[PDB]
Subunit: 223 residues, 3 copies
C-alpha cells in the first residue's frame, strides 16, 4: 500500500471486473452470428484491462525509470493494457461499417506503432528523446482518427441507417477520448512532470474506464 495512487488502481480494478461481468451476462442468449461477433470483442477489452489494473494494483506492472533527475515510477502495464485493447476497439469500429480488409490492416498497424512508440518514450531515460517518441506516437494517432473521420464516415453513409448514426456516435466518442491520452502523458510525470503521478493515475483510470466499459455500453445497446 506504499503507493498513494493505489486507491485509483483499486477503483480501476473493481470497475473493469464488474464491466466484464455485465457484458458477459448481457451476451447470454445471443445467437445472431453478427452480434455474437460484437459481444466477443466488447467483453474481451474489460477482461484484459481488469488483469492489467490488478497487476498495477498488486504492483507487478510497474518499474523505475531514471529521468528528469528522479527515479520515476512507470506503470508499464498501463501500456501493455492499451496495446491489447485499442486494436480490439478498432475492430469494433471497423466491423460496424464493414470496412475492407486493407483499411483494417493499416488501422491496427497504425495503432500498434502508436502504443509501441509511447512505451518506448515512456521507458526512455534521456529526457529530450522522450518527446521525440511522443511526437511519433501522436502522429500515428492522427492517422487513425483521420481514417475513422473521413474514410469510415463515408462508408457509414452508404450502409444501414441503424449502423450510420450508431457509428456517428461512437466515432465522436472515440475522437475525444483517444486524444486526451497524449495530453495527460505530456503533463504527467512521464513527460513535463507538472501533474503528479497520483493525479496522473486518476486521469488515466477515468479515461480507461470510459473507453473500455462506456464505449461498449453504447455499442452493445445499439440495434
Amino acid at each position: 500500500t506504499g503507493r498513494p495512487e493505489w486507491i485509483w488502481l483499486a477503483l480501476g480494478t473493481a470497475l473493469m471486473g464488474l464491466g466484464t461481468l455485465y457484458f458477459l451476462v448481457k451476451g447470454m442468449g445471443v445467437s445472431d452470428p453478427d452480434a455474437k461477433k460484437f459481444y466477443a470483442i466488447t467483453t474481451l477489452v474489460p477482461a484484459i484491462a481488469f488483469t492489467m489494473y490488478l497487476s498495477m494494483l498488486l504492483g507487478y506492472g510497474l518499474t523505475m525509470v531514471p529521468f528528469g533527475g528522479e527515479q520515476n515510477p512507470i506503470y508499464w502495464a498501463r501500456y501493455a493494457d492499451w496495446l491489447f485493447t485499442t486494436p480490439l476497439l478498432l475492430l469494433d469500429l471497423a466491423l460496424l461499417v464493414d470496412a475492407d480488409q486493407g483499411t483494417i490492416l493499416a488501422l491496427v498497424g497504425a495503432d500498434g506503432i502508436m502504443i509501441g512508440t509511447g512505451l518506448v518514450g515512456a521507458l526512455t531515460k534521456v529526457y529530450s528523446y522522450r518527446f521525440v517518441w511522443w511526437a511519433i506516437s501522436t502522429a500515428a494517432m492522427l492517422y487513425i482518427l483521420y481514417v475513422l473521420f473521413f474514410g469510415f464516415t463515408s462508408k457509414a453513409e452508404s450502409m444501414r441507417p441503424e449502423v450510420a448514426s450508431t457509428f456517428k456516435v461512437l466515432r465522436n466518442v472515440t475522437v475525444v477520448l483517444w486524444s486526451a491520452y497524449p495530453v495527460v502523458w505530456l503533463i504527467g510525470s512521464e513527460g513535463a512532470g507538472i501533474v503528479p503521478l497520483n493525479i496522473e493515475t486518476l486521469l488515466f483510470m477515468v479515461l480507461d474506464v470510459s473507453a473500455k466499459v462506456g464505449f461498449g455500453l453504447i455499442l452493445l445497446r445499439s440495434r
Copy 2:
C-alpha cells in the same frame, strides 16, 4: 548439466523434434484445401515446442524468482511455449466444427489471459499473490472448456458424422489434458512447493508431449 531435471528436458526436446518430422512427412502430397489447413496447424505446434524445450534444455528459457524463502528456478520458456501453441490447438478444434468468427475470437482471447496470468503468477514474488493469479487463470480455463463442451458439441451434432465423432474424441482428450496443468502448477515448486522441480518438470513434459504430438496423431489420422 547442473540441473537434475535436464534429462526430462532432453527427452522432451527429442520427442518434439521427431513429432515435428512425422507430421511434416505425413503432410506431403496433401492437395485438399481443408486438410492442408489442418496440417499447417498440426505441424507448427511441435516445432515451436521443440525450440522451447531446447531453450529450456540449453537453459536460455529459465530465470530465478525469490518466493517462499528460496531462489526458485522458473522455466519461463515453458509458459512462452503454451502461449504460442494453445491458441493453435484451439483453432484446430474450432475449424473442425466450423465455428463462427466471434467464438474463435473469444476462445483465443480467453486462452491468452489464461496463459498470460499464469506467467504473471509464476513470476510473482509475494507468495500470497501468486495464487490470486492462479485463480484468475483457472477461471479463464473454465470459460474455454465450457465453450468447447456446451457450444461446440452442439455445432458438432449438426455437421458431418465424420467430424462429429472426431470432435467428440478430441473434445474429451482436451478436457482431461488441459485441466491437469493447473493442478501440477499448484502442487509444484511454483505453488505449494510439495512436488519437487524435477518431478514437476517430468509431469509437464509428459503432458506437453501428449498435448502437442498425441493430439495431432488423433486429428491427422481422421477422415
Copy 3:
C-alpha cells in the same frame, strides 16, 4: 554519438522515413479494394523499420551480451524489426498468388521461428550454442523459400499473366535478399567475429533498405 556505426543507423533511419512517405503519397486516391490491401501492407513495413532504426540510432534498441570473451553490443531492435516486417512481406507475396489459408499460416509460422530463434542465438552467451540456434533459424528460412519457389510459382502459372511475371520477379528478389542475412550474421560480431560491428551494421542497413523499400517499389509499380 559514441557508436562509430551510428552514421549507418542515421542513414538507415532517414531512408526508411522517406520510404514511408513515398508509399503514403502514392497510395492516395486508390479505391480499388485489392490495391488498397497491397498498399496497406507495403507502407507499414518501412514505418515500423523507421521506428526501429531510430530506436537503434537513439540507442534504445541495443544491449550488451558477454560472449567470445567480450561485452558484445547487440542491436536487439534489429531483430524486433524483422519479426514485425518479414511476415508482412510474406503476406505481400502470398496475397499476390491468392494462396490458400493454410499455406499462409505455415509460411508465417515458419517465419516466426526463424526470427525468434535467431534472436535467441543472438542473445545466447555460451559461444558454441549460438550456432545451434543459427542452424535452427536457417532451416526455417529454407522451408520458407522452398514454399515460395516450388509451391507458389506453381500457383503463379495458373493465375493472371500480369501476376505471374510480377510474382516471378519478386520471388527471385526475395530468394537472394533473405539468404544474405544468415551469412552476414555468421561472419559478423554475433557469430564468428571477423567482420566488425561497424561493417556489420552497414551490411544490415543496405539489405534492410533494399528489402523494405525497394521490394515495395517493385510491387507498387506493378499492374
